Predict the structure of fluorescent protein D21H/K26C.
Amino acid sequence: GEELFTGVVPILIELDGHVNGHCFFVRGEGEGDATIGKLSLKFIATTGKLPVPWPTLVTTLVQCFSRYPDHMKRHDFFKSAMPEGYVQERTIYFKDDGTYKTRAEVKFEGDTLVNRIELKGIDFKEDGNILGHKLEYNFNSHKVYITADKQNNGIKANFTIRHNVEDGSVQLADHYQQNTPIGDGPVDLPDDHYLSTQTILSKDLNEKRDHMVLLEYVTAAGI
Amino acid sequence: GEELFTGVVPILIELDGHVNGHCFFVRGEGEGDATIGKLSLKFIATTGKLPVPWPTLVTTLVQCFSRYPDHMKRHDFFKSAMPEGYVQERTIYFKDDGTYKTRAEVKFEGDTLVNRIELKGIDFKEDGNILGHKLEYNFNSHKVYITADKQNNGIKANFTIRHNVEDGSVQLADHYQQNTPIGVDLPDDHYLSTQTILSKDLNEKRDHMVLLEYVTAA
């Protein structure tokens, strides 16, 4: 499990989403390097202009690439579930607005790590920050708090994404996460700890499709 | 099963589709009356302008509402699978063009009959009759040939939809169909005689399809 993530690993991401009365599909490719905790990915909206802001999809669009330092490696659930993988389910409550529900499967296909997701959004306000496109194309840094879940032989996670808004205000998004192991074996049930995330969103300037070029760095701590 | 379809029954149709890079979702509502073999419905493209012609959708957007006369009622699979319902899978080959694959679930939710579908289209030519929107807004009448399928305790159907083209050129669509029970009658070889009208509800600015259909078994 652990030693599948030495060296640069290619990544495929696929997101099928329905929000309110809109649909979209977003595919992404790139590479992951868990020794340094880094992702670089390019995402494309194959269905044309996204009906929701790119930043609202970041957390949905592969935490097995977080850097777990030597003393922390006995708490790395994500890598220990591999190669068979895990299911990642979330409910994301945007304050004073709608909700995303998501179900993803993270696993290896050949040497490529693939994250295939379905997303349903409901009860979004028209001309809220989401459907009204009022969110700045930027990302902040967060702590993803992780606790063992014996009931599922799995982990729970909680955290609040802060999404900067046009008006200087901030749009909060409460994430309530659940992960499990697709196959039978030993997945590591960790002490309460967290992931420290940082992310940069930019845009390939000679790409005329709706897209997102991301840069990320994630490391575990808190023990 | 059978006697769930006496009287007018409300219908919900849910359609999710991906076709050559475009996505779309269609919802439809209306009523069905199997005693007369009738099913009026209004469909709406919630995702905006449909990337494919409405008529191609026909044959995917509830055959439990076909009229089976007294002498034919022992051959009505669709109604006998209720209330639990059936899966309806199809492959639709548009001649000299792409292909729709579909998987639907037809079943009762409360007293409403629901048909929830997923549709994948592939290998469509970009300026064909489908992606190029060259099909007239209409429908013709057809025979849906039905044979029992004991391997899957269900039925297999085959028929060819004729879609009129603006250039007085007809676009054929070969339907291969397979129905199984989520929970059953296994019928003699017979068929459904279908008739359909497609219209628009003036005063509606969304992309839509009003449909009237009359179907009887023979």
Remarks:
- The first strand of chain B starts at residue 9 and ends at 19.
- Residues 156 and 178 of chain B are 5 Å apart (CA to CA).
- The helical segments of chain B are 54-57, 77-80.
